[PDB]
Write a protein that binds this ligand. Structure first.
Ligand SMILES: [Zn+2]
Length: 557
């Protein structure tokens, strides 16, 4: 049906191919402290691309935008059509790069019109935010040297060509040239330091002891702006909120106990957050959460610990690790753009990516963890430790049927760990580890224990398939004895040899305990073909590190 869509925009108007791209993406995102900051920043990025797109839509129509496909785009439904949209709207699913069919004469003004609208809105927000941080100097907070940072920050490169998949190729590399040619938290002047202030005097002024620049102020305000433009806010506020979803711990906790813990936490103070389900925090600190010079009863603390600890002996210890899942398509730069072909095929692909990202990835994540972003062939999610692998694979299969292949970094991490770093490492797994294998179609799973230890393992998607249905998974104590032993041998390498090492080790860990040993060796061998590695030592290392991680009793209690 999208042929008769293009015939219009191609015939009805004197047609010129316009292209949008907002430049600060991976930076703006990684500069975030708490999970909310990461959602807020990525979501806004989408907001911008929406206001960029809004202009195209307003002046013309939706079918004039090739990429992304605007059918089912939750922002538009909610915002442009005033549809009564549900929690869909919390997920950011518009990417930066875009492609529209524009009328030759508008091409010039549409460029400046997009530029203004972004600035206008960001400014519009900075203000609204300025008011909010006052609610919870303030005249000269809107100096036209701070206004600058806001307008100057996000760069929106816009380019066009008249009327071939070659024109598309010429539009991209022409476009990808204007890009580069066009403290707080982050290399940007703080909203007070840039004029004349001491760093001691600076920190004192700011609401949480950390001084913010204008951009990061917009980050903080956005979650309340959204709550009052749409209805709702992120379901899992903290990283800890998603960490406590491991084997329904929180839900189980919020029945047997929960009311009594709330009660217990009322009579210590008014902590009316999630950290407090951990015994550790009640001993470890609380000082920080004391925003007032009031008194804290100590028996209440001592016997909040006792309550929780006894809770833990009847329920299990509370989960303290969570997953960062980042995903990205392979060999698809030139597919999204259309060089590898505009015919309706380029729309078809756009619709395929739109559909996957909006519906299929959400149906996979599905209140079982936080889907921050799905731009077509790329995903950010915070997951519980026991959903990471399961979600990743599920999503991979789906992107299968809807481009072709897709890699992934998963970073399991202790909750108390700096996000900026965690987010950085997860990215690195995906880009520097995963995407650098020959047949780049791989899971790069990493585990960083609070110890400082950092196990990584690079794996084919087929491995998780084989491993579920594996006899080997069925037993993993015996496992603790097995895996550690193997990993020890392959710390350097078994001088005995790799094959004979596994035999002796499978052998070591009455009618059926011959066929069983013989089955495991087979699987263990089968599995290695799916570990990405350049020799059996690397492959063995790789599998038994995947084994090591999946089974770790501190991460998976
Ligand atoms: Zn900042």
């Amino acid at each position: 049906w999208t042929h008769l869509d293009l015939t219009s925009a191609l015939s009805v108007k004197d047609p010129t191919l316009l292209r949008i791209k907002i430049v600060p993406v991976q930076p703006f995102i990684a500069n975030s402290r708490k999970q909310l900051d990461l959602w807020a920043s990525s979501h806004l990025l989408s907001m911008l691309m929406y206001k960029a797109l809004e202009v195209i839509v307003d002046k013309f129509g939706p079918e004039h935008v090739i990429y992304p496909s605007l059918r089912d785009q939750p922002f538009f439904l909610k915002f442009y059509l005033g549809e009564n949209i549900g929690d869909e709207i919390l997920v950011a699913n518009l990417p930066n790069k875009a492609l529209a069919i524009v009328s030759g004469k508008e091409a010039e003004k549409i460029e400046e019109e997009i530029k203004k609208r972004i600035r206008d809105f960001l400014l519009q927000l900075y203000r609204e935010a300025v008011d909010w941080a006052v609610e919870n100097e303030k005249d000269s907070m809107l100096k036209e040297a701070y206004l600058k940072i806001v307008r100057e920050y996000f760069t929106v490169s816009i380019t066009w060509v008249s009327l071939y998949p070659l024109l598309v190729k010429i539009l991209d590399s022409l476009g990808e040239r204007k890009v580069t040619e066009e403290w707080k938290c982050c290399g940007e002047n703080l909203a007070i330091f840039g004029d004349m202030y001491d760093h001691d005097n600076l920190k004192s002024l700011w609401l949480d002891e950390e001084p913010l620049c204008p951009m990061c102020l917009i980050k903080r305000y956005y979650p309340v702006w959204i709550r009052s433009k749409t209805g709702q806010k992120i379901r899992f506020e903290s990283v800890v909120d998603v960490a406590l979803l491991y084997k329904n711990w929180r839900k189980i906790f919020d029945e047997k106990y929960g009311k009594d813990l709330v009660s217990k936490a009322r009579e210590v103070s008014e902590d009316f957050d999630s950290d407090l389900y951990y015994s550790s925090t009640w001993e470890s600190g609380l000082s920080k959460k004391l925003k007032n010079k009031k008194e804290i009863d100590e028996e209440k603390v001592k016997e909040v610990v006792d309550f929780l600890n006894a809770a833990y002996k009847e329920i299990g210890n509370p989960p303290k690790y969570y997953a960062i899942l980042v995903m990205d398509g392979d060999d698809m730069g030139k597919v999204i753009s259309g060089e590898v072909l505009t015919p309706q095929v380029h729309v078809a692909i756009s619709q395929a990516l739109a559909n996957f990202s909006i519906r299929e990835v959400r149906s996979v994540v599905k209140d079982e963890g936080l889907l921050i972003y799905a731009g077509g062939d790329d995903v950010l999610a915070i997951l519980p430790v026991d959903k990471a692998l399961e979600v990743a694979y599920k999503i991979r299969k789906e992107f299968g049927k809807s481009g072709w292949k897709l890699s992934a970094g998963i970073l399991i991490v202790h909750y108390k760990h700096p996000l900026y770093d965690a987010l950085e490492k997860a990215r690195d797994l995906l880009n520097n580890k995963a995407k650098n294998v020959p047949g780049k179609d791989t899971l790069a799973i990493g585990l960083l224990k609070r110890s400082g230890s950092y196990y990584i393992s690079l794996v084919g998607w087929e491995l998780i398939r084989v491993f579920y249905n594996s006899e080997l998974r069925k037993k993993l104590g015996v496992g603790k004895r097995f895996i550690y032993h193997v990993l020890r041998e392959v710390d350097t390498w078994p001088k005995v040899g790799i094959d004979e090492m596994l035999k002796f080790e499978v052998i070591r860990h009455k009618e059926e305990t011959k066929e069983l040993r013989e089955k495991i060796y087979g699987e263990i061998k089968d599995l290695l073909e799916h570990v990405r590695g350049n020799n059996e030592v690397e492959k063995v290392r790789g599998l038994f590190t995947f084994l090591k991680i999946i089974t770790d009793a501190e991460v998976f209690p």
